Symmetry: D2
Subunit: 171 residues, 4 copies
């Protein structure tokens, strides 16, 4: 037998423990188009039709964006775009109204409600109109059979839509 | 009614979705002491007794370390230190053996097994001995009623011990 | 050395693996009171004030119900009741409207919106009025600093309110 | 305006909230074969070779068992069986020893250690030998690239092996 003293300099009294962390993935699309018909006399939307290029997704990360395009997500090869079609705008007042439309994600379509909040209506510098509104609402992954392989535990079943728009009159 | 065109520059077609992420918290203790009796003739440990100052924890983060000291973790005010006491070393060969001892965390004591792996035995530059071994093993939070408030979901019930030691002869 | 044959009858080739499962806790309250002023000429609510006895919770399980009363949940000793006070009803049509009111849980108050859906308005058998409506909406635990000890991982931050009411005229 | 009183009999003041629950899946295999060479003079294993029919899995549930056979698990069509081959038994004493062998799951092979605990050695009623031992150890899903599609969050990366054997001498 013999006696030793630790060399604290090259000794590590260590442990590893596994924990979970919840975080929001925030994201948008760089490439989309829309048709907007709005009546500032009454603060009513008349037609709102949006097409989004799935390809142009951005969640501030280069490799997860590619993965979104694959079979277990968007399947962008087969279904390159997602679309929203307004069916009904029910005004609450000049600032607020309930929008109902058809959302289509990878060929599956469901009718959703978004909360329209009008942030500002104006006649601009040049005497031509502008508006700044938002559309907000929660859709369920399950309702669109979207990313069915991924469990509702790992990734929430709820997606929260926040569409923030500035827009000017045409021609 | 009137027609608008989005100003893509001040429009954001956005979404938020919640996901979970699993990660290892790695950590050690900066301040501990040990008594080590080892016989290089036979590669057997004779006595190994460690005292760790809970206060000196480090998981590479200043604020979680403080939180570890609180009631729902270490309770360092009441139980400032954790201790290991070897009871039995069962040699497998010169590189490997099974160590059995008493671990005490916040006043609760249980007998654990660690896997001893001898990385190197030597007579040094100056003709005095050295050794470099490791002790590895999994303990269960539940076995020590440790952090009972925190669910086995958020934080694993398993803690993985990795004690890496370099040490030299005494006097 | 010697050769053996398993007795399949008293041999078990076994394994254990840990998995997570997501489930809805559904619940209601057995004991509450309300004041309801409604105008069937216009399908508008005028006053809606509810008081719920936290004590009377029921999630189909005797022991979790008790636990709900404790400090890390309702604190029913200090805050025996939760209250809702209508501030504003904004009609959409005769079937649908947006209700805004003050919810109070354990002394913390916040203004919420519920979606009112009128399932049926009637003059009854005896020529006295009835109505059957629902109130639906999502509140956030975090908004009320409710059950702060429990992580948003183990238990959702979102509570989904579904108030289903049948009601008859007074005196 | 008009005043109503709830019909408590057909009124439900209700809520739904999502929570996670951790549970052990326990399981075994009904159909396997083994070759066992053991020396009761020294309490050493000499040869231990097991073949397990993946098909015969049982986790007390008819539909999850089928799912285990599919591509995202065992792929039983391609890889019908899992095998263990002992390479080395290192005795600790007559009750305990460390077993090292090759585990193969769906064509991927890795060397594992199991803790052998001898529960009983005997010469039976009829003067022929018996033994009753157990083999215990943790393997990692990731080490065998097993069920790669399923996240380490939903299902633990750790599988815990508990092989409980009774066995009698041959011919
Ligand atoms: S367009 C856009 C890019 C990145 C992010 N993001 O922060 O990950 C957003 C967003 O917050 O919606 C939008
Ligand atoms: S002593 C020490 C400090 C920090 C870390 N760490 O990486 O968080 C370790 C470790 O990896 O064990 C040790
Ligand atoms: S009042 C009531 C009791 C039990 C349940 N439950 O199913 O757990 C409910 C509900 O579904 O809302 C209501
Ligand atoms: S062979 C066998 C069948 C069922 C179970 N089970 O309880 O799910 C076991 C086990 O506990 O190992 C074994």
């Amino acid at each position: 037998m013999k006696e030793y003293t630790l060399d604290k300099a090259h000794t590590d009294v260590g442990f590893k423990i596994k924990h979970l962390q919840i975080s929001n993935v925030k994201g948008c699309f760089k490439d989309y188009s829309a048709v907007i018909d709005f009546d500032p006399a009454s603060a009513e939307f008349k037609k709102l039709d949006v097409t989004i290029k799935i390809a142009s997704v951005n969640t501030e990360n280069q490799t997860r964006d590619n993965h979104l395009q694959q079979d277990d997500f968007f399947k962008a090869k087969k279904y390159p775009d997602m679309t929203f079609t307004m069916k009904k705008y029910e005004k609450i007042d000049n600032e607020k109204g309930k929008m109902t439309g058809t959302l289509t994600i990878a060929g599956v379509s469901k009718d959703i409600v978004l909360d329209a909040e009008i942030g500002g209506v104006a006649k601009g510098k040049d005497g031509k109109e502008k508006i700044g509104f938002s559309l907000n609402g929660k859709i369920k992954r399950s309702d669109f059979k979207f990313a069915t392989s991924t469990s509702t535990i790992t990734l929430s079943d709820d997606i929260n839509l926040n569409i923030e728009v500035e827009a000017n009159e045409k021609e």
